[PDB]
Design a protein around this ligand. Structure first.
Ligand SMILES: *[C@@H]1O[C@H](CO)[C@@H](O[C@@H]2O[C@H](CO)[C@@H](O)[C@H](O)[C@H]2NC(C)=O)[C@H](O)[C@H]1NC(C)=O
Ligand SMILES: *[C@@H]1O[C@H](CO)[C@@H](O)[C@H](O)[C@H]1NC(C)=O
Ligand SMILES: *[C@@H]1O[C@H](CO)[C@@H](O)[C@H](O)[C@H]1NC(C)=O
Ligand SMILES: *[C@@H]1O[C@H](CO)[C@@H](O)[C@H](O)[C@H]1NC(C)=O
Ligand SMILES: *[C@@H]1O[C@H](CO)[C@@H](O)[C@H](O)[C@H]1NC(C)=O
Ligand SMILES: *[C@@H]1O[C@H](CO)[C@@H](O)[C@H](O)[C@H]1NC(C)=O
Lengths: 226, 193, 97, 40
C-alpha cells in the first residue's frame, strides 16, 4: 500500500508539473528578473542623459572635440549611473540568490542526506525523504512526507491506576474504545492490551489528576500457574 | 494568531502535520516533556505546580511588557528607521543640489526656460540621486526584513507547530512550546522553556 | 516580520506640477520605472512575508468555550471578546507600546 | 451572469477542534504525500 501511494504521488507530481505552467515560478521569476535587468541596461544606451545625442559617434562628428567633451561627460555620467544601478541591483539579487542557495544546500544536507525533524522544513507533514531534481538555475525537491488521514475519537487518561499504583505508558497513549482500555502509539491507531512491558509504574494513584481505574496484564503470572 | 494558538492548545503539533487531532493539554505538555528527555511522570506528579509556574510566567511577561518601555525595541527600531528614511527623502526636496533655487516653480519663473533648463537638470540629478539612495537603503532594509521574516516563519513552524530540539533556537533552555502574538510590523513569541 | 508598505511615484517626487521637468526626465531613460518596480517588489515582498509568517495554518481553529486545560491559563494570549478588536491582553499592549 | 466580485477574504473554514479533557484523536490511516519545492 505504501509503495503504491509513493508511486501514485510521484505520478501525480509528474502530471501536475506537466499541466500547470506556473509551477516553476521561482526559477522563471529569477530568469525574467535577470533578463529584464539586462534589457534595461542595454536600452539605457538609447537615452540622451542630457546630451544632445544619444549615440556617441554622432556627437563626436557633428561637434568639435572641445565642445563635444562636455556632451561625452554627460553621456558617461549617465551610463556610469546606469552601470552602478545595475551592479547594485545585481549584488542585492545575488545576495538573495545566495541565501536561497544556502537554504537549498541545507535542505539537501538535512533531507536528501538525512531525515530532518524540523517541522515544515522539508514538506508539510512528518518528513520522510527528499529527492533532488536539477532545474535551470535552481533545484527542485520532491519532499516525501507522512500525513495522517483518518482520525478517530477516543477516550484517554494520563495514567492507569492498577494495584494501587499509577501506570504510565512507556511509549504510546492510553485509549479506550468505550469499554476496554488500550495503549496506542501516538501517530497510528494500533491498540495494544495493557501490560507491564509497555507501561512503567511511577508512584501511587492519589497524585495524578485524571487517572482511571483499570487492570494491567502480568506476562509472567500465567507461566507461574503452568 | 488565534487560529495558531487554538491549534497549539487543543491539538499540539498535530495541526501542522495534517489533520488537527485533539488531545488534553496536560497530555500535550507531557508529550513536550518527553520531547526533552524528561519522563512524562514528572508532570503528572507535579501538574498543579507546573500549571501555576506557567501561569505566573505568563503574568510576569504581562507585567514586564507593560512596565518596561524598551521591550519592543526591534519593531520600534524598524518603524523609526523607515519613518526617518521617509523624512530624509522628503527633506531632500529643500536642498538646492547646486541649483540657485530649491523650489522648482521659482526657477522656471524668474529664469527663462533656455537657461532654467540647466538648473532643472541640477535639481533632477540631485533628486534622482536621493531616490536611488532611498531605494537602495530600502532594498537592503527589505533584505534584512525578509531574513527576519524567514526566521520568524521558521520559528513558527518549528516551535509553534512543533517542538524544536535546536538549542537556544526558541528560548534559553529545553524548549517546550511557543505562542505567537501579533505586533505592529512583526511578531512576538512567548517561548515556553 | 514586515516593514511599512510605502511607494514613491518617481515623476511626482522629482517633478511637481510642471511638465518641463517631466520632459527633461523622460530623456534620462527608465530610472523612474526601475525605482517604481523595486518599490512594488518590496511591497509584494512585505505582503509575502506576512502571509508566510502568519498563514502557516490552513484552517481557522477556535478555542472551546470552556477553558478546562488542567490549570494552564491562556487568557493572556487567547483573544478577549470584550474589546472591539479580538486581540489578546498581551497583544493589546504590544500594539499600544 | 458572470462579474467581478469584491469581498473580504476568508481565511478558511472555522474548524473548532472538539477539545475535551478526555478525548484524543489517534489517526488510523496515513498518506505518503510528495510535496514539490522549487528553490533558485
Ligand atoms: C488507508 O487509505 C488507503 C488509501 O489512501 C486505502 O487503500 C485503498 O482502499 C480502497 C478501499 O477498498 C481500495 O479500493 C484501494 O484499492 C486501496 N488502495 C488505494 C491506493 O486506494 C486503505 O484501505 C486505507 N486503510 C484503512 C484501514 O482504511
Ligand atoms: C469527535 O467528536 C466530535 C463531537 O463529539 C465531532 O465533532 C468530531 O467529528 C469527532 N471526530 C471524529 C474523527 O469523528
Ligand atoms: C473494544 O475492543 C475490544 C477488543 O478486545 C472488543 O472486544 C470490544 O468489543 C470493543 N468494544 C467496542 C464498544 O468497540
Ligand atoms: C474533565 O472535566 C470534567 C468537568 O467537570 C470533570 O468532571 C472530569 O472529572 C474531568 N476529567 C479529567 C480526567 O480531567
Ligand atoms: C479506583 O479504585 C479504587 C479502589 O479500587 C477506589 O478507591 C477509587 O475511588 C477508584 N477511583 C475512581 C476514579 O473510580
Ligand atoms: C485565568 O486568568 C484569568 C485572569 O486573567 C481569570 O479570570 C481566570 O479565572 C483564570 N482561569 C482560567 C483557567 O480561565
Amino acid at each position: 500500500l505504501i509503495a503504491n501511494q509513493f508511486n501514485s504521488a510521484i505520478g501525480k507530481i509528474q502530471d501536475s508539473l506537466s499541466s500547470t505552467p506556473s509551477a516553476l515560478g521561482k526559477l522563471q521569476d529569477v530568469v525574467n528578473q535577470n533578463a529584464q535587468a539586462l534589457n534595461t541596461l542595454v536600452k539605457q544606451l538609447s537615452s540622451n542623459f542630457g546630451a544632445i545625442s544619444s549615440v556617441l559617434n554622432d556627437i563626436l562628428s557633428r561637434l568639435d572635440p572641445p565642445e563635444a567633451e562636455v556632451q561625452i561627460d554627460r553621456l558617461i555620467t549617465g551610463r556610469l549611473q546606469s552601470l552602478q544601478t545595475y551592479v547594485t541591483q545585481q549584488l542585492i539579487r545575488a545576495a538573495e540568490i545566495r541565501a536561497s542557495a544556502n537554504l537549498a544546500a541545507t535542505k539537501m544536507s538535512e533531507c536528501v542526506l538525512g531525515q530532518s525533524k524540523r517541522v515544515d522544513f522539508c514538506g508539510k507533514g512528518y518528513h520522510l525523504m527528499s529527492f533532488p531534481q536539477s532545474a535551470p538555475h535552481g533545484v527542485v525537491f520532491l519532499h516525501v512526507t507522512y500525513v495522517p488521514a483518518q482520525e478517530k475519537n477516543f477516550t484517554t487518561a494520563p495514567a492507569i491506576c492498577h494495584d494501587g499504583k499509577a501506570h504510565f505508558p512507556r511509549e504510546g497513549v492510553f485509549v479506550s474504545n468505550g469499554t476496554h482500555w488500550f495503549v496506542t502509539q501516538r501517530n497510528f491507531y494500533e491498540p495494544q492490551i495493557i501490560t507491564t512491558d509497555n507501561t512503567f509504574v511511577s508512584g501511587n494513584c492519589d497524585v495524578v489528576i485524571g487517572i482511571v481505574n483499570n487492570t494491567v496484564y502480568d506476562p509472567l503470572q500465567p507461566e507461574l500457574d503452568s | 494568531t488565534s487560529a495558531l494558538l487554538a491549534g497549539t492548545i487543543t491539538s499540539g503539533w498535530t495541526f501542522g502535520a495534517g489533520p488537527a487531532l485533539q488531545i488534553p493539554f496536560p497530555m500535550q505538555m507531557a508529550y513536550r516533556f518527553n520531547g526533552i528527555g524528561v519522563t512524562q511522570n514528572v508532570l503528572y506528579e507535579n501538574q498543579k505546580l507546573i500549571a501555576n509556574q506557567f501561569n505566573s510566567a505568563i503574568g510576569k511577561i504581562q507585567d514586564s511588557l507593560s512596565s518596561t518601555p524598551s521591550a519592543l525595541g526591534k519593531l520600534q527600531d524598524v518603524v523609526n528607521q523607515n519613518a526617518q528614511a521617509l523624512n530624509t527623502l522628503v527633506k531632500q526636496l529643500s536642498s538646492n543640489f547646486g541649483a540657485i533655487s530649491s523650489v522648482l516653480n521659482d526657477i522656471l519663473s524668474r529664469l527663462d526656460p533656455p537657461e532654467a533648463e540647466v538648473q532643472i537638470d541640477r535639481l533632477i540629478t540631485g533628486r534622482l540621486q536621493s531616490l536611488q539612495t532611498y531605494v537602495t537603503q530600502q532594498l537592503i532594509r527589505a533584505a534584512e526584513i525578509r531574513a527576519s521574516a524567514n526566521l520568524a516563519a521558521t520559528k513558527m513552524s518549528e516551535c509553534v507547530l512543533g517542538q524544536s530540539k535546536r538549542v537556544d533556537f526558541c528560548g534559553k533552555g529545553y524548549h517546550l512550546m511557543s505562542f505567537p502574538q501579533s505586533a505592529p510590523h512583526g511578531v512576538v513569541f512567548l517561548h515556553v522553556t | 516580520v514586515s516593514m511599512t508598505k510605502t511607494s514613491v511615484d518617481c515623476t511626482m517626487y522629482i517633478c511637481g506640477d510642471s511638465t518641463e521637468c517631466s520632459n527633461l526626465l523622460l530623456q534620462y531613460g527608465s530610472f523612474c520605472t526601475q525605482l517604481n518596480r523595486a518599490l512594488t517588489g518590496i511591497a509584494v515582498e512585505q505582503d509575502k512575508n506576512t502571509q508566510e509568517v502568519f498563514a502557516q495554518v490552513k484552517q481557522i481553529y477556535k478555542t472551546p468555550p470552556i477553558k478546562d486545560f488542567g490549570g494552564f491559563n491562556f487568557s493572556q494570549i487567547l483573544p478577549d471578546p470584550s474589546k472591539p478588536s479580538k486581540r489578546s491582553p498581551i497583544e493589546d499592549l504590544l500594539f499600544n507600546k | 451572469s458572470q462579474s467581478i466580485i469584491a469581498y473580504t477574504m476568508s481565511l478558511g473554514a472555522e474548524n473548532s477542534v472538539a477539545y475535551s479533557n478526555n478525548s484524543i484523536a489517534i489517526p488510523t490511516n496515513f498518506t505518503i504525500s510528495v510535496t514539490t519545492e522549487i528553490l533558485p
